[PDB]
């Protein structure tokens, strides 16, 4: 059972997020302040300056030598039980595809832990669960959103060879992509070219246009393009320098000086109120809140709020979590959909309606669902 004052600490940490979100839904839908080109300049700022400094602020204050490794294995066994059953679904059943393996992995295992999970669980359970949610944000940024980037690059590099080398691709020796090309999925004309050698060998060169390969060829092609999406990504620099500093700042006690700890904190203090303002600007620019259909908005919000936590009840118990760490682990799994899984689905067109329903409609029912777990778990 919960006390009525502990319900006030949740509202103290969550109602400020929805105030910032309805003021931005109002300033576009209702009172017409922002032009949709002006409105896309605030999303630009948040995606590059505010969230990479908000995620730096949390990761650099983490202690990487005192991470709860029993709790941390229950979150990384959710994402193996899910990802094994998807691997044993696309290979067995003939209707399974790789476009749904990426969608069902985002919809069921990757929540919004950074902007709404750290403020939410800090009010519900205290300062330790706001320290455990930082440890998940470290592992999503550095492992699970950099695996999911391999699954989008593999999805792009498999279409281009099935469309253009349908009967010859068993003889490709190397694939060189020109350095101009960043995404080879449905965006650029991509004049590819092959080089027939003296014995059936084949050198492929993907170029920019104007007017089954061996696994040693594809896994050289994927790692090139993953590297070109990883140094242009602003949250890799937030995650590299955040982990590099906290491995130094917590062994030799080197406290970061107040020139630099305040130069970062002048834009990172913007980051949490600007993320919710940017998220409410996005749900106003879309024509419908439920966009994917009503039979798929009940599917996007059953993978998230039911299949999400019910696979961390078979994983958080097999690891050995009990008490409050079981209750923190289930409630963090029922958080709404993270936005970085949508940002990949917008770029690659792997169901951008289901992953925009689940972000937008997930936020609106996020609070009365996680409060429903917070009542049922304590009883």
């Amino acid at each position, epitope marked *: 059972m919960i006390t009525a004052a502990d319900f006030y600490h949740v509202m103290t940490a969550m109602v400020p997020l929805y105030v910032a979100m309805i003021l931005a839904y109002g300033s576009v839908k209702w009172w017409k302040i922002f032009t949709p080109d002006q409105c896309s300049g605030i999303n630009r700022f948040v995606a590059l300056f505010a969230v990479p400094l908000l995620s730096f602020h949390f990761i650099a204050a983490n202690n990487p030598y005192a991470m709860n490794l029993r709790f941390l294995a229950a979150d990384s066994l959710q994402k193996v039980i899910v990802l094994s059953l998807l691997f044993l679904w696309c290979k067995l059943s003939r209707n399974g595809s790789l476009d749904w393996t990426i969608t069902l992995f985002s919809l069921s295992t990757l929540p919004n832990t950074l902007v709404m999970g750290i403020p939410l669980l800090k009010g519900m359970y205290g300062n330790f669960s706001g320290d455990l949610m930082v440890q998940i944000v470290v592992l999503q940024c550095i492992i699970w959103y950099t695996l999911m980037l391999f699954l989008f690059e593999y999805r792009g590099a498999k279409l281009l060879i099935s*469309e*253009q*080398f*349908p*009967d*010859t691709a068993g*003889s490709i020796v190397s694939i060189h992509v020109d350095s101009d090309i960043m995404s080879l999925d449905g965006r650029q004309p991509l*004049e*590819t*070219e*092959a*080089e*027939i050698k003296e*014995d*059936g060998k084949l050198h*492929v060169t993907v170029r920019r246009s104007n007017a089954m390969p061996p696994t040693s060829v594809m896994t050289r092609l994927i790692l090139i393009m993953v590297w070109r999406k990883l140094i242009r990504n602003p949250n890799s620099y937030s995650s590299l320098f955040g982990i590099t500093w906290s491995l130094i700042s917590f062994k030799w006690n080197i406290e970061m000086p107040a020139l630099i700890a305040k130069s970062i904190s002048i834009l990172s203090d913007a980051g949490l109120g600007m993320a919710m303002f940017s998220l409410g600007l996005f749900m106003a620019l879309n024509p419908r809140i439920i966009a994917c259909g009503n039979r798929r908005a009940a599917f996007a919000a059953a993978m998230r709020f039911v299949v999400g936590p019910a696979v961390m009840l078979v994983a958080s118990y097999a690891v050995g979590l009990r008490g409050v760490l079981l209750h923190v682990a289930i409630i963090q799994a029922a958080l709404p959909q993270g936005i970085v899984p949508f940002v990949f689905a917008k770029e690659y067109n792997v169901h951008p309606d289901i992953l925009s329903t689940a972000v937008i409609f997930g936020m609106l029912i996020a609070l009365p669902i996680t409060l429903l777990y917070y009542i049922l778990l304590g009883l």
Partner: nanobody
Amino acid sequence: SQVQLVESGGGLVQAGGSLRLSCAASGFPVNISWMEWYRQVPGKEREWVAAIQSTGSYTWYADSVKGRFTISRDNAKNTVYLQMNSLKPEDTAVYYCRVKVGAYYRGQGTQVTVS
């Protein structure tokens, strides 16, 4: 099959001679005709020359060599020739064909040299 291009016809020739290059296609799937030809000097910024495209209706000749380079198709032999006349001295570059079967496959072996 291990599909292979064969190119020949290149050699040493003075200005104003006559050449007839070869592009022997063998081993392909169903070939949509977009067999091209272009030049390549050791300097960059290459430029396209000809085409024998879809029905032989219109070819794409360059504006500098329009109407003077004769291109022709034999579907039985699967070989497209490129006849050259009034050979200008800026034709020492390599001339190789670019058969398009969805991805442009091309070879390298000629020695078109005009002195």
